Amino acid sequence: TINDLPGISQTVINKLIEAGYSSLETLAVASPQDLSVAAGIPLSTAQKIIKEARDALDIRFKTALEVKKERMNVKKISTGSQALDGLLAGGIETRTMTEFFGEFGSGKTQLCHQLSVNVQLPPEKGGLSGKAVYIDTEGTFRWERIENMAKALGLDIDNVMNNIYYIRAINTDHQIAIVDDLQELVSKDPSIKLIVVDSVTSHFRAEYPGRENLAVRQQKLNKHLHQLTRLAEVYDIAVIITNQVMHTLYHVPGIRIQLKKSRGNRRIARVVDAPHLPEGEVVFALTEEGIRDA
Q: Which domains does the chain have, with CATH numbers?
A: 1-60 (1.10.150.20), 61-294 (3.40.50.300)
Report the alpha-carbon distance of residue 285 to residue 18 in Å, rounded: 29
* Pairing status of strand 280-287 against strand 266-273: antiparallel
CA distances from 255 to 133, 169, 252 (A): 20, 24, 10
Note whether 67 and 75 are within 8 A (CB).
no
Solving technique: X-ray
Annotated binding site for ATP: 102-109
CA distances from 45 to 1, 48, 88, 102, 122 (A): 18, 4, 32, 36, 50
Note whether 266 and 285 are within 8 A (CB).
yes
CA distances from 156 to 80, 113, 117 (A): 18, 16, 11
Residue 268, amino acid: I
Q: Tell me the CA end-to-end span of the chain in Å, nearest whole number.
A: 27
Annotated binding site: 102-109
Q: Is the backbone of residue 40 left (phi > 0), alpha (psi -120 to 50) or beta? A: left
Resolution (A): 2.9
81-108 burial string, b = 16+ CB within 10 Å, else e?
bebbbbbbbbbbbbebbbbbbbeeebbb
Report the alpha-carbon distance of residue 4 to residue 190 in Å, rounded: 41
Note whether 262 and 270 are within 8 A (CB).
no
CA distances from 176 to 67, 74, 173, 187 (A): 40, 30, 5, 18
3-state secondary structure of 8: coil
Residue 33, amino acid: Q
Report the alpha-carbon distance of residue 225 to residue 237 in Å, rounded: 15
